[PDB]
Amino acid sequence: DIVMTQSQKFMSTSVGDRVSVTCKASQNVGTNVAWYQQKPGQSPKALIYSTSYRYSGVPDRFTGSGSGTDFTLTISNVQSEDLAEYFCQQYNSYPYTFGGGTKLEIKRADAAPTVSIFPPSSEQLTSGGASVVCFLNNFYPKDINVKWKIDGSERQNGVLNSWTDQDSKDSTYSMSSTLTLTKDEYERHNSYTCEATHKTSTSPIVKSFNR
Amino acid sequence: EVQLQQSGPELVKPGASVKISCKTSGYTFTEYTMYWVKQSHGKSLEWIGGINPNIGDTSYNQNFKGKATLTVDRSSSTAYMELRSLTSEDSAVYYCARDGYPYYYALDHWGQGTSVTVSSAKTTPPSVYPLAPGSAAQTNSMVTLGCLVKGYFPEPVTVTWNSGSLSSGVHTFPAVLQSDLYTLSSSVTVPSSTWPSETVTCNVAHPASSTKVDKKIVPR
Amino acid sequence: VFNATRFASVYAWNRKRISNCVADYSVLYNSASFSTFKCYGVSPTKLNDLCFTNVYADSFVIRGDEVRQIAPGQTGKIADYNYKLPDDFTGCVIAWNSNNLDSKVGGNYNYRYRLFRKSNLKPFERDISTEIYQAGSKPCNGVEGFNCYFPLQSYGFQPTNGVGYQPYRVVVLSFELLHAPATVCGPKKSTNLVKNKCVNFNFNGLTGTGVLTESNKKFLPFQQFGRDIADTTDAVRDPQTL
Amino acid sequence: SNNLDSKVGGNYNYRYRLFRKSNLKPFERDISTEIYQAGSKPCNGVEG
């Protein structure tokens, strides 16, 4: 079937700026393509059909051009309601092949994360297992790499992560790292550190604790 | 007013079958074609098939041929999608649509979405666990706290700090899976002028088990 | 039209123009070989008293349930897509039962109908297209598929069918009253010829009263009657006997 | 008098004549509910 490729997946434009969302097709789709808008959690709504016409209730700033291979959904004056998930569809041959999706973001200044490690409490010590967490709050941009080192040895099993969406007040990210292990494996070593690198510094941000 | 209302979220075991409805009102149900889609978490969208109410012609995707069938009830204007042989890969939301060709459109006009999850676990109440900052003055400017949950089902829980009064920097991270049971954490920023002089607690509640548990953050 | 060998389809409804002749409708009203007979605006037997310019007869075969759709101010698959009628129809409708004539074991495939059309027809419109009917936003490209169907469909005219589903040879008799002269009229009557008696006269284009006798006057082959010095009639040529 | 003589399901009480064997005279009441004949076959008190 048709492979609708979107590149890239992330884009960052501030308010009052021009943004262009593009997606390609594999075969000759013709003219009949579409574009949609999906708020986080809500249902997707339709924006542009047949790459030249809007819908009933959508703003007039959502314009589209292109035919054959390249299609572009250009927005002139973006707003806070423009932050959504945008997809592209085809209507040429069954089955219908949706696109990949592109999420919009707000541009911000560069800020280093404020890392914080929390050792397991005494209620964890009498439960059956242990888990040490490493919070990372208020950083920009989204790219980051956390690395749990156990006395100088990088641990890979049981290292789970959970990123967040962008905060609607300061446009900063947050993420957490959960390292799960058993009792005697926690008291087998003596130190634990939460290495996290970023583009805001050459050397990574170091934090650790003992025992 | 044209309105599409779907069903509620269904918890289902693997291997079973469900029926997802999409009631229709505000337009002529017979002429317009109804589609069905599927959106997995974090990945791209995918199309399943479409059914025509006046005739009954169907054309499913080739990856969903032995997965979903479609039936239309013209006596109540309600369509149905019946999923078969469910596995852990069907943790997705499912929407209903509506074609728009006799109005000079290419419209789909998506509905609400039914969150259908798959698991083999009984509903287990959560167990909160505090986080040690720890003792004092780490750091000297702003100290962060937190409270974990571990082993609960299903989503969601309502994590409120100080019974819903402290909201200056609450970061409830989304839930992940480590042992076929959800877990998450929360991160707050309390200034040094109130901690550890005043009591800052973490209130996690579960609507699926009706259990209210609170744990006070103790400096250790 | 009423006794045609092989009728046409509904979407291919035939029309036969009739004019410049006499039309005896009284034999139809007293034929007793019709399931229904309905005339709008005028009585069926009074048609022999009126004159018209042009008269057409739209013929086709339909199922029994579709018979009510054949009228002004109706709706249906035939009233919209195959043969639509106006709101001011004042012709006539005659129904013959064809369950023993045009029915076929296993359905009659010679007759079809546009079960699907992009939109509605006009009064006395015909659409013999074979374009694949599109219902969805996808293109049919001349072939069928999702929301793409061949619009014309065969009929199930069968001995197994019921009264509402057996075929019915329908004939809608259209009429026209234009500024052009009247060309079709009903049949006129007559009687025997009396003489030597005071009687009234109603000839082809002349009336009056008087006594009528033979004469020795020499009319021309094209002369009908004569007048005297005072422009008063005094003679007449019998139309049925020279 | 749409508020008085009307009726939701249709008023059967107020009726009219549809057929007749001849023309009515001035100020001539007629209440014959006989089945009107139009063809040659007798009616004998039934439509058909």
PDB file of C-alpha atoms in Angstrom, chain C residues 39-238:
ATOM      1  CA  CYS C  39     -57.368   9.929 -15.287  1.00  0.00           C
ATOM      2  CA  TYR C  40     -56.275  13.225 -13.738  1.00  0.00           C
ATOM      3  CA  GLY C  41     -58.270  16.378 -14.441  1.00  0.00           C
ATOM      4  CA  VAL C  42     -60.743  14.740 -16.851  1.00  0.00           C
ATOM      5  CA  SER C  43     -63.029  11.727 -16.826  1.00  0.00           C
ATOM      6  CA  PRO C  44     -61.829   8.704 -18.840  1.00  0.00           C
ATOM      7  CA  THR C  45     -65.022   8.514 -20.917  1.00  0.00           C
ATOM      8  CA  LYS C  46     -65.142  12.287 -21.502  1.00  0.00           C
ATOM      9  CA  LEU C  47     -61.888  12.062 -23.491  1.00  0.00           C
ATOM     10  CA  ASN C  48     -63.981  11.362 -26.598  1.00  0.00           C
ATOM     11  CA  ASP C  49     -65.482  14.869 -26.276  1.00  0.00           C
ATOM     12  CA  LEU C  50     -62.209  16.856 -26.121  1.00  0.00           C
ATOM     13  CA  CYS C  51     -59.604  17.679 -28.759  1.00  0.00           C
ATOM     14  CA  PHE C  52     -55.849  18.044 -28.269  1.00  0.00           C
ATOM     15  CA  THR C  53     -52.728  19.006 -30.207  1.00  0.00           C
ATOM     16  CA  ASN C  54     -50.307  16.171 -29.376  1.00  0.00           C
ATOM     17  CA  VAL C  55     -50.789  12.995 -27.345  1.00  0.00           C
ATOM     18  CA  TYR C  56     -47.951  10.754 -26.144  1.00  0.00           C
ATOM     19  CA  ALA C  57     -47.996   7.377 -24.401  1.00  0.00           C
ATOM     20  CA  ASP C  58     -45.123   6.631 -22.010  1.00  0.00           C
ATOM     21  CA  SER C  59     -44.819   2.846 -21.668  1.00  0.00           C
ATOM     22  CA  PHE C  60     -42.801   0.728 -19.237  1.00  0.00           C
ATOM     23  CA  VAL C  61     -43.115  -2.255 -16.889  1.00  0.00           C
ATOM     24  CA  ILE C  62     -42.841  -1.898 -13.100  1.00  0.00           C
ATOM     25  CA  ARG C  63     -43.643  -3.815  -9.934  1.00  0.00           C
ATOM     26  CA  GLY C  64     -46.995  -3.439  -8.212  1.00  0.00           C
ATOM     27  CA  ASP C  65     -45.674  -1.461  -5.248  1.00  0.00           C
ATOM     28  CA  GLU C  66     -44.188   1.134  -7.620  1.00  0.00           C
ATOM     29  CA  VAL C  67     -47.587   1.824  -9.221  1.00  0.00           C
ATOM     30  CA  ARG C  68     -48.507   4.470  -6.635  1.00  0.00           C
ATOM     31  CA  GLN C  69     -45.219   6.231  -7.401  1.00  0.00           C
ATOM     32  CA  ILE C  70     -46.570   6.751 -10.952  1.00  0.00           C
ATOM     33  CA  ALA C  71     -48.537   9.924 -10.211  1.00  0.00           C
ATOM     34  CA  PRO C  72     -48.003  13.676  -9.688  1.00  0.00           C
ATOM     35  CA  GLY C  73     -46.427  14.530  -6.360  1.00  0.00           C
ATOM     36  CA  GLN C  74     -44.837  11.145  -5.595  1.00  0.00           C
ATOM     37  CA  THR C  75     -41.453   9.900  -4.422  1.00  0.00           C
ATOM     38  CA  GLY C  76     -39.572   6.678  -5.004  1.00  0.00           C
ATOM     39  CA  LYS C  77     -36.878   4.942  -6.987  1.00  0.00           C
ATOM     40  CA  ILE C  78     -38.865   5.300 -10.220  1.00  0.00           C
ATOM     41  CA  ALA C  79     -40.464   8.647  -9.354  1.00  0.00           C
ATOM     42  CA  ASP C  80     -36.947  10.123  -8.944  1.00  0.00           C
ATOM     43  CA  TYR C  81     -34.350   8.122 -10.892  1.00  0.00           C
ATOM     44  CA  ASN C  82     -36.038   6.256 -13.792  1.00  0.00           C
ATOM     45  CA  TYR C  83     -39.248   8.085 -14.762  1.00  0.00           C
ATOM     46  CA  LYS C  84     -40.232  11.192 -12.799  1.00  0.00           C
ATOM     47  CA  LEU C  85     -43.596  12.893 -13.317  1.00  0.00           C
ATOM     48  CA  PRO C  86     -44.462  16.596 -12.886  1.00  0.00           C
ATOM     49  CA  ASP C  87     -46.688  18.041 -10.177  1.00  0.00           C
ATOM     50  CA  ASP C  88     -49.379  19.122 -12.692  1.00  0.00           C
ATOM     51  CA  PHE C  89     -49.917  15.819 -14.497  1.00  0.00           C
ATOM     52  CA  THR C  90     -53.372  15.732 -16.104  1.00  0.00           C
ATOM     53  CA  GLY C  91     -53.021  12.766 -18.456  1.00  0.00           C
ATOM     54  CA  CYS C  92     -54.123   9.237 -17.596  1.00  0.00           C
ATOM     55  CA  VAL C  93     -52.759   5.991 -16.172  1.00  0.00           C
ATOM     56  CA  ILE C  94     -53.706   2.479 -17.318  1.00  0.00           C
ATOM     57  CA  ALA C  95     -52.460  -0.678 -15.589  1.00  0.00           C
ATOM     58  CA  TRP C  96     -52.332  -4.156 -17.126  1.00  0.00           C
ATOM     59  CA  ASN C  97     -51.334  -7.233 -15.133  1.00  0.00           C
ATOM     60  CA  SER C  98     -48.286  -8.860 -16.748  1.00  0.00           C
ATOM     61  CA  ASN C  99     -47.636 -11.610 -14.182  1.00  0.00           C
ATOM     62  CA  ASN C 100     -48.650 -14.138 -16.866  1.00  0.00           C
ATOM     63  CA  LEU C 101     -47.192 -12.107 -19.772  1.00  0.00           C
ATOM     64  CA  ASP C 102     -43.835 -10.533 -18.822  1.00  0.00           C
ATOM     65  CA  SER C 103     -42.923 -12.744 -15.843  1.00  0.00           C
ATOM     66  CA  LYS C 104     -40.001 -15.168 -16.089  1.00  0.00           C
ATOM     67  CA  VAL C 105     -39.095 -18.169 -13.958  1.00  0.00           C
ATOM     68  CA  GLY C 106     -36.057 -16.968 -12.041  1.00  0.00           C
ATOM     69  CA  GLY C 107     -36.716 -13.275 -12.667  1.00  0.00           C
ATOM     70  CA  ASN C 108     -37.065 -11.316 -15.909  1.00  0.00           C
ATOM     71  CA  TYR C 109     -33.585 -10.072 -16.828  1.00  0.00           C
ATOM     72  CA  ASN C 110     -34.698  -8.358 -20.050  1.00  0.00           C
ATOM     73  CA  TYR C 111     -36.074  -5.478 -17.942  1.00  0.00           C
ATOM     74  CA  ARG C 112     -33.908  -3.396 -15.605  1.00  0.00           C
ATOM     75  CA  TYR C 113     -34.069  -0.122 -13.707  1.00  0.00           C
ATOM     76  CA  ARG C 114     -31.727   2.524 -12.340  1.00  0.00           C
ATOM     77  CA  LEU C 115     -31.785   1.579  -8.663  1.00  0.00           C
ATOM     78  CA  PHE C 116     -29.053   4.197  -8.039  1.00  0.00           C
ATOM     79  CA  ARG C 117     -28.662   7.716  -9.425  1.00  0.00           C
ATOM     80  CA  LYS C 118     -26.471  10.674  -8.520  1.00  0.00           C
ATOM     81  CA  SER C 119     -29.571  12.870  -8.165  1.00  0.00           C
ATOM     82  CA  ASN C 120     -33.224  13.032  -9.224  1.00  0.00           C
ATOM     83  CA  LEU C 121     -34.717  13.218 -12.710  1.00  0.00           C
ATOM     84  CA  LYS C 122     -36.970  15.869 -14.265  1.00  0.00           C
ATOM     85  CA  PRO C 123     -40.561  15.435 -15.489  1.00  0.00           C
ATOM     86  CA  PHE C 124     -40.598  13.099 -18.499  1.00  0.00           C
ATOM     87  CA  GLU C 125     -36.803  12.727 -18.312  1.00  0.00           C
ATOM     88  CA  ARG C 126     -34.891   9.603 -19.331  1.00  0.00           C
ATOM     89  CA  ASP C 127     -31.391   8.566 -18.233  1.00  0.00           C
ATOM     90  CA  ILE C 128     -29.853   5.622 -20.104  1.00  0.00           C
ATOM     91  CA  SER C 129     -26.339   6.117 -18.695  1.00  0.00           C
ATOM     92  CA  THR C 130     -24.250   3.228 -17.347  1.00  0.00           C
ATOM     93  CA  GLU C 131     -21.921   5.338 -15.185  1.00  0.00           C
ATOM     94  CA  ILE C 132     -20.906   3.681 -11.921  1.00  0.00           C
ATOM     95  CA  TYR C 133     -22.760   5.432  -9.106  1.00  0.00           C
ATOM     96  CA  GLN C 134     -20.443   7.018  -6.533  1.00  0.00           C
ATOM     97  CA  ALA C 135     -21.720   7.370  -2.949  1.00  0.00           C
ATOM     98  CA  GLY C 136     -18.442   7.996  -1.105  1.00  0.00           C
ATOM     99  CA  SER C 137     -15.495  10.337  -1.509  1.00  0.00           C
ATOM    100  CA  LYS C 138     -13.495   7.585  -3.324  1.00  0.00           C
ATOM    101  CA  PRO C 139     -13.225   7.397  -7.139  1.00  0.00           C
ATOM    102  CA  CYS C 140     -14.872   4.508  -8.954  1.00  0.00           C
ATOM    103  CA  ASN C 141     -12.677   4.796 -12.083  1.00  0.00           C
ATOM    104  CA  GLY C 142     -15.424   3.086 -14.088  1.00  0.00           C
ATOM    105  CA  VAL C 143     -15.311  -0.098 -11.962  1.00  0.00           C
ATOM    106  CA  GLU C 144     -17.089  -1.072  -8.759  1.00  0.00           C
ATOM    107  CA  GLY C 145     -15.920  -1.288  -5.159  1.00  0.00           C
ATOM    108  CA  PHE C 146     -16.386   0.651  -1.932  1.00  0.00           C
ATOM    109  CA  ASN C 147     -19.428   2.869  -2.553  1.00  0.00           C
ATOM    110  CA  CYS C 148     -19.212   2.181  -6.300  1.00  0.00           C
ATOM    111  CA  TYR C 149     -22.001   0.145  -7.905  1.00  0.00           C
ATOM    112  CA  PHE C 150     -23.430  -0.408 -11.372  1.00  0.00           C
ATOM    113  CA  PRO C 151     -26.637   1.681 -11.103  1.00  0.00           C
ATOM    114  CA  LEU C 152     -28.899  -0.366 -13.381  1.00  0.00           C
ATOM    115  CA  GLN C 153     -30.354  -3.486 -11.763  1.00  0.00           C
ATOM    116  CA  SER C 154     -32.414  -6.369 -13.094  1.00  0.00           C
ATOM    117  CA  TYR C 155     -35.955  -7.140 -11.951  1.00  0.00           C
ATOM    118  CA  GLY C 156     -37.366 -10.088 -10.038  1.00  0.00           C
ATOM    119  CA  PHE C 157     -40.480 -10.460 -12.203  1.00  0.00           C
ATOM    120  CA  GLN C 158     -41.385 -14.071 -11.450  1.00  0.00           C
ATOM    121  CA  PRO C 159     -44.399 -16.378 -11.098  1.00  0.00           C
ATOM    122  CA  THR C 160     -43.314 -16.605  -7.446  1.00  0.00           C
ATOM    123  CA  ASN C 161     -43.730 -12.841  -6.997  1.00  0.00           C
ATOM    124  CA  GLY C 162     -46.783 -11.390  -5.290  1.00  0.00           C
ATOM    125  CA  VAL C 163     -49.306  -8.815  -6.419  1.00  0.00           C
ATOM    126  CA  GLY C 164     -47.023  -5.980  -5.308  1.00  0.00           C
ATOM    127  CA  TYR C 165     -43.958  -7.464  -7.045  1.00  0.00           C
ATOM    128  CA  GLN C 166     -45.275  -8.969 -10.284  1.00  0.00           C
ATOM    129  CA  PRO C 167     -44.740  -6.926 -13.470  1.00  0.00           C
ATOM    130  CA  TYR C 168     -47.330  -4.413 -14.639  1.00  0.00           C
ATOM    131  CA  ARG C 169     -47.342  -2.971 -18.154  1.00  0.00           C
ATOM    132  CA  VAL C 170     -47.858   0.728 -17.365  1.00  0.00           C
ATOM    133  CA  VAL C 171     -48.992   3.263 -19.976  1.00  0.00           C
ATOM    134  CA  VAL C 172     -49.160   6.966 -19.068  1.00  0.00           C
ATOM    135  CA  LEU C 173     -51.185   8.877 -21.667  1.00  0.00           C
ATOM    136  CA  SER C 174     -49.842  12.417 -21.997  1.00  0.00           C
ATOM    137  CA  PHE C 175     -51.828  15.276 -23.523  1.00  0.00           C
ATOM    138  CA  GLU C 176     -50.895  18.655 -24.988  1.00  0.00           C
ATOM    139  CA  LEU C 177     -52.874  21.857 -25.596  1.00  0.00           C
ATOM    140  CA  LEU C 178     -50.606  24.248 -27.501  1.00  0.00           C
ATOM    141  CA  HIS C 179     -51.320  27.304 -29.634  1.00  0.00           C
ATOM    142  CA  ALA C 180     -50.763  24.963 -32.588  1.00  0.00           C
ATOM    143  CA  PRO C 181     -54.043  23.578 -33.969  1.00  0.00           C
ATOM    144  CA  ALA C 182     -55.870  20.586 -32.562  1.00  0.00           C
ATOM    145  CA  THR C 183     -54.911  17.390 -34.390  1.00  0.00           C
ATOM    146  CA  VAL C 184     -56.389  14.555 -32.274  1.00  0.00           C
ATOM    147  CA  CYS C 185     -60.077  14.296 -31.403  1.00  0.00           C
ATOM    148  CA  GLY C 186     -62.567  11.724 -30.235  1.00  0.00           C
ATOM    149  CA  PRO C 187     -64.940   9.841 -32.497  1.00  0.00           C
ATOM    150  CA  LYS C 188     -68.112  11.613 -33.577  1.00  0.00           C
ATOM    151  CA  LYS C 189     -71.538  10.018 -33.907  1.00  0.00           C
ATOM    152  CA  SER C 190     -74.249  10.254 -36.556  1.00  0.00           C
ATOM    153  CA  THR C 191     -77.646   8.884 -37.555  1.00  0.00           C
ATOM    154  CA  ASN C 192     -79.801   8.112 -40.582  1.00  0.00           C
ATOM    155  CA  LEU C 193     -80.990  10.734 -43.078  1.00  0.00           C
ATOM    156  CA  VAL C 194     -84.560  12.073 -42.994  1.00  0.00           C
ATOM    157  CA  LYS C 195     -86.291  14.136 -45.671  1.00  0.00           C
ATOM    158  CA  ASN C 196     -89.560  16.018 -46.129  1.00  0.00           C
ATOM    159  CA  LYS C 197     -89.732  16.742 -42.399  1.00  0.00           C
ATOM    160  CA  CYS C 198     -89.004  19.770 -40.224  1.00  0.00           C
ATOM    161  CA  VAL C 199     -85.862  18.759 -38.311  1.00  0.00           C
ATOM    162  CA  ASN C 200     -82.673  20.228 -36.880  1.00  0.00           C
ATOM    163  CA  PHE C 201     -79.299  20.077 -38.634  1.00  0.00           C
ATOM    164  CA  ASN C 202     -75.865  19.526 -37.087  1.00  0.00           C
ATOM    165  CA  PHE C 203     -73.438  18.926 -39.949  1.00  0.00           C
ATOM    166  CA  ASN C 204     -69.635  18.733 -39.825  1.00  0.00           C
ATOM    167  CA  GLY C 205     -69.183  22.513 -39.850  1.00  0.00           C
ATOM    168  CA  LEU C 206     -72.748  23.769 -40.080  1.00  0.00           C
ATOM    169  CA  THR C 207     -75.913  23.792 -37.986  1.00  0.00           C
ATOM    170  CA  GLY C 208     -79.442  25.100 -38.258  1.00  0.00           C
ATOM    171  CA  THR C 209     -83.020  23.976 -38.732  1.00  0.00           C
ATOM    172  CA  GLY C 210     -85.308  23.333 -41.664  1.00  0.00           C
ATOM    173  CA  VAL C 211     -86.764  20.792 -44.047  1.00  0.00           C
ATOM    174  CA  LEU C 212     -84.315  18.783 -46.154  1.00  0.00           C
ATOM    175  CA  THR C 213     -84.973  17.455 -49.660  1.00  0.00           C
ATOM    176  CA  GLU C 214     -83.053  16.248 -52.680  1.00  0.00           C
ATOM    177  CA  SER C 215     -82.088  18.680 -55.421  1.00  0.00           C
ATOM    178  CA  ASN C 216     -80.686  19.079 -58.925  1.00  0.00           C
ATOM    179  CA  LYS C 217     -77.971  21.578 -57.956  1.00  0.00           C
ATOM    180  CA  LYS C 218     -74.483  20.769 -59.250  1.00  0.00           C
ATOM    181  CA  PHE C 219     -71.977  21.134 -56.426  1.00  0.00           C
ATOM    182  CA  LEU C 220     -68.265  20.862 -57.049  1.00  0.00           C
ATOM    183  CA  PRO C 221     -66.334  17.943 -55.500  1.00  0.00           C
ATOM    184  CA  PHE C 222     -64.930  20.248 -52.780  1.00  0.00           C
ATOM    185  CA  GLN C 223     -68.025  22.379 -52.077  1.00  0.00           C
ATOM    186  CA  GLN C 224     -69.873  21.537 -48.862  1.00  0.00           C
ATOM    187  CA  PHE C 225     -72.828  23.944 -48.767  1.00  0.00           C
ATOM    188  CA  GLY C 226     -74.244  26.955 -50.574  1.00  0.00           C
ATOM    189  CA  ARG C 227     -75.605  30.377 -49.695  1.00  0.00           C
ATOM    190  CA  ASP C 228     -78.128  32.642 -51.397  1.00  0.00           C
ATOM    191  CA  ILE C 229     -77.916  36.327 -52.340  1.00  0.00           C
ATOM    192  CA  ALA C 230     -78.636  37.296 -48.714  1.00  0.00           C
ATOM    193  CA  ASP C 231     -75.755  35.158 -47.363  1.00  0.00           C
ATOM    194  CA  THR C 232     -78.208  32.564 -46.038  1.00  0.00           C
ATOM    195  CA  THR C 233     -77.783  28.818 -46.342  1.00  0.00           C
ATOM    196  CA  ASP C 234     -80.049  26.991 -48.786  1.00  0.00           C
ATOM    197  CA  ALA C 235     -78.216  23.713 -49.507  1.00  0.00           C
ATOM    198  CA  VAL C 236     -75.704  21.227 -48.132  1.00  0.00           C
ATOM    199  CA  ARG C 237     -73.658  18.219 -49.244  1.00  0.00           C
ATOM    200  CA  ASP C 238     -74.063  15.178 -47.024  1.00  0.00           C
TER     201      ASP C 238
END
